Amino acid sequence: MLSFQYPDVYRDETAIQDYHGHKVCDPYAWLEDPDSEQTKAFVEAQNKITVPFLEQCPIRGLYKERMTELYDYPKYSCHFKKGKRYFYFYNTGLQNQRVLYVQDSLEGEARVFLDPNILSDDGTVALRGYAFSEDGEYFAYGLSASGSDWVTIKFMKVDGAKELPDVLERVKFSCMAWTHDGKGMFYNAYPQQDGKSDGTETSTNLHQKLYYHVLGTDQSEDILCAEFPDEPKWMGGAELSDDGRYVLLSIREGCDPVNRLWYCDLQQESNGITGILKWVKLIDNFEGEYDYVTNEGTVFTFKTNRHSPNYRLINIDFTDPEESKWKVLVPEHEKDVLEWVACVRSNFLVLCYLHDVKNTLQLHDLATGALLKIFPLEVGSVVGYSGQKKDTEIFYQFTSFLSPGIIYHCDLTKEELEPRVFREVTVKGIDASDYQTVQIFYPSKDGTKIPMFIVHKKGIKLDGSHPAFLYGYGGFNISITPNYSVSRLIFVRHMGGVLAVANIRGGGEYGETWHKGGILANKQNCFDDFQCAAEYLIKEGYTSPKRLTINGGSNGGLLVATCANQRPDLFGCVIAQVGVMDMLKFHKYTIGHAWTTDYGCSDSKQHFEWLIKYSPLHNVKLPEADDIQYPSMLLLTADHDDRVVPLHSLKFIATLQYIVGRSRKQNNPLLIHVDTKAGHGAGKPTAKVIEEVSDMFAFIARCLNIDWIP
Numbered sequence: 001m002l003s004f005q006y007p008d009v010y011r012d013e014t015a016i017q018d019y020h021g022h023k024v025c026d027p028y029a030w031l032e033d034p035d036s037e038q039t040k041a042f043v044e045a046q047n048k049i050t051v052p053f054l055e056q057c058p059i060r061g062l063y064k065e066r067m068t069e070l071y072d073y074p075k076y077s078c079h080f081k082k083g084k085r086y087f088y089f090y091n092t093g094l095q096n097q098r099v100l101y102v103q104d105s106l107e108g109e110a111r112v113f114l115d116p117n118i119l120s121d122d123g124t125v126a127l128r129g130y131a132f133s134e135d136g137e138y139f140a141y142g143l144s145a146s147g148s149d150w151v152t153i154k155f156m157k158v159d160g161a162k163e164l165p166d167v168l169e170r171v172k173f174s175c176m177a178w179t180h181d182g183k184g185m186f187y188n189a190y191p192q193q194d195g196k197s198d199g200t201e202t203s204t205n206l207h208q209k210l211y212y213h214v215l216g217t218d219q220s221e222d223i224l225c226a227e228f229p230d231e232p233k234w235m236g237g238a239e240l241s242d243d244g245r246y247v248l249l250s251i252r253e254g255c256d257p258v259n260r261l262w263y264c265d266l267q268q269e270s271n272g273i274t275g276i277l278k279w280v281k282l283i284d285n286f287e288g289e290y291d292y293v294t295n296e297g298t299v300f301t302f303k304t305n306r307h308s309p310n311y312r313l314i315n316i317d318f319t320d321p322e323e324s325k326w327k328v329l330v331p332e333h334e335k336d337v338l339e340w341v342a343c344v345r346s347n348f349l350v351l352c353y354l355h356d357v358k359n360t361l362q363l364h365d366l367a368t369g370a371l372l373k374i375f376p377l378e379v380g381s382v383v384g385y386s387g388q389k390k391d392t393e394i395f396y397q398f399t400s401f402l403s404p405g406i407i408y409h410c411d412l413t414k415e416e417l418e419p420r421v422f423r424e425v426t427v428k429g430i431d432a433s434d435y436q437t438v439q440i441f442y443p444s445k446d447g448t449k450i451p452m453f454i455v456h457k458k459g460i461k462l463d464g465s466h467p468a469f470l471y472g473y474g475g476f477n478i479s480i481t482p483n484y485s486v487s488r489l490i491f492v493r494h495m496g497g498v499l500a501v502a503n504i505r506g507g508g509e510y511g512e513t514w515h516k517g518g519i520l521a522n523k524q525n526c527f528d529d530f531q532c533a534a535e536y537l538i539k540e541g542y543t544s545p546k547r548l549t550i551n552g553g554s555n556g557g558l559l560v561a562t563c564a565n566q567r568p569d570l571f572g573c574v575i576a577q578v579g580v581m582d583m584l585k586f587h588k589y590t591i592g593h594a595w596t597t598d599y600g601c602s603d604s605k606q607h608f609e610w611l612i613k614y615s616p617l618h619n620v621k622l623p624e625a626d627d628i629q630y631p632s633m634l635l636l637t638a639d640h641d642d643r644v645v646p647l648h649s650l651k652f653i654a655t656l657q658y659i660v661g662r663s664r665k666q667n668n669p670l671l672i673h674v675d676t677k678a679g680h681g682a683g684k685p686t687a688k689v690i691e692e693v694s695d696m697f698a699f700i701a702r703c704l705n706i707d708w709i710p
């Protein structure tokens with residue numbers, strides 16, 4: 001297996017930092033600098049041993065070809081109306097980036113509106129955010145290069161798809177909202193910083209400001225409408241009310257589902273948007289989330305979690321703002337999470353609920369909050385929707401582990417609502433009938449029942465002989481719901497695998513209580529939940545530790561890496577994608593400061609104590625038992641991942657290779673693959689996606705010696 005030698009990596013034994021009396025050495029701290037010749041050489045040497053290992057087993061070629069075939073199917077988004085025209089995204093099958101089409105009529109012939117594919121040879125320039133003007137005659141869109149979060153906003157005139165000269169730079173984590181007068185658009189921008197701003201830098205992002213750009217002018221003329229010099233981490237996103245009268249400002253600090261809500265009655269501005277707006281601080285604290293749904297005059301309907309962990313809808317009247325006066329339009333459910341709400345056809349509300357990690361869709365009346373219609377859906381997730389206040393119809397996209405996805409449409413003007421299939425594509429190759437998805441609830445260490453989805457071929461023997469791929473995230477109120485993955489189904493069909501997704505704490509599956517159940521002092525709950533999920537699959541005979549693979553990305557990357565350190569005996573293979581590995585320094589880079597709401601910060605003595613116990617980078621240790629070694633490990637990252645700076649994986653792999661790799665008993669490989677012209681994941685071209693999943697399953701195939709099944 002290991003027919004190579006790990007690269008010689010220098011250890012700076014003098015790099016020792018004090019954390020409230022706790023001294024920690026950081027010998028690979030030099031890897032934090034992406035531009036040095038030393039780090040560049042480290043990356044080059046790592047990939048030099050990783051690549052040949054991945055490409056050696058012919059299985060990679062078989063998987064790649066099979067993925068190219070199965071992934072080649074029509075992928076559409078929901079149709080959405082803007083002005084007098086309809087729009088929808090569409091990928092014929094293997095295009096690197098999906099294309100935006102336009103058609104003047106629902107029955108009319110569509111034409112390409114914007115094709116990101118012609119902007120680069122390798123499809124590494126992608127659309128990241130967009131917003132049409134209220135009348136739908138002007139379009140603003142963001143473009144990111146090589147997977148970076150940095151955006152450049154460009155403009156177009158819809159009629160004739162004419163390119164405009166307006167160009168906005170230094171845009172990141174930005175809103176995009178046109179004022180209804182059609183004069184300009186609000187957006188967020190960061191101050192000028194030394195060094196690079198292309199996604200390879202590690203520089204922290206602070207002092208984000210809200211600007212307003214007048215169409216037809218240079219960015220230098222942009223009006224500063226809001227800023228927080230005393231609070232560097234505050235981020236203010238703007239949006240216009242459905243009636244265009246109010247600018248709603250949602251200020252966030254961190255990643256908790258909470259925000260301050262300030263508003264500006266545009267009718268009350270002296271003479272238009274000329275500077276800092278006359279903000280009325282309706283909700284001036286970070287105690288709850290207030291998500292704007294719609295308003296009728298001064299009565300604003302918001303989805304909130306204020307003393308409602310599963311979320312509810314409340315009406316706040318600007319003329320009588322006190323909390324005791326707020327009306328509860330749609331009360332919180334005792335268990336089901338209200339994920340999102342949209343207002344359509346003037347007085348209808350589309351409510352989407354998460355019931356035991358499965359979605360439901362319902363139409364409610366705006367005035368009373370009363371349920372009017374239940375849109376029939378199978379076991380899966382709603383991952384697409386269209387229907388604004390002025391629209392008279394809705395489109396919604398449904399998907400599941402076994403179904404590619406069905407797009408439904410419903411004309412809301414009709415007396416009797418008849419929802420119908422608008423678009424449905426099937427993947428000829430993966431016969432859904434041959435598989436089944438079962439949901440179970442297993443007890444974690446403390447007794448808490450945790451949901452887990454298992455996908456496998458029908459009629460398999462539970463004798464523990466099957467390879468398994470267990471996925472998890474566990475954090476930031478993110479719910480891991482059913483989704484169609486061609487890559488995972490190939491593992492099932494062509495590698496005889498068992499798929500599993502553990503809905504561990506930290507996620508939003510059971511509201512804010514579920515979220516708080518996997519954060520700060522209780523982050524260990526996440527790891528414990530996932531480890532118990534692994535034990536469940538083993539105990540119940542779905543797989544065995546030597547046949548088990550665990551995967552996670554970003555916060556899930558931390559999940560799988562930590563689980564490798566804590567229970568190396570439970571897994572055969574671990575694939576950690578773009579993970580947070582250095583829990584003591586994560587807050588120092590790019591947007592890392594925002595994650596402290598989930599992890600805490602090492603600056604605090606109390607937080608450091610939680611963090612030091614699980615930080616992957618600080619817990620690599622040779623297993624005590626002679627018959628126990630670390631499982632095979634593959635860390636995937638990229639040089640433009642400015643969300644989770646690559647240094648996390650660089651320092652981690654260097655530590656794994658030195659501490660564990662050098663031991664005799666370590667026969668399983670510990671590798672890293674750093675991709676070029678790629679970032680955290682969003683906007684990654686189809687070509688790179690296929691290369692990535694091929695590397696993953698080939699690594700698994702080679703390490704567990706799995707035969708490909710034709």
Ligand SMILES: *C(=O)[C@@H]1CCCN1C(=O)[C@@H]1CCCN1C(=O)OCc1ccccc1
Pocket residue numbers: 173235252254255476553554555556580591594595643644
């Ligand atoms: C992947 O899990 C990484 C590392 C841990 C958190 N995280 C993120 O990408 C988080 C959670 C999803 C969104 N996110 C994030 O940092 O978004 C940037 C941001 C935007 C607006 C306010 C604060 C942060």
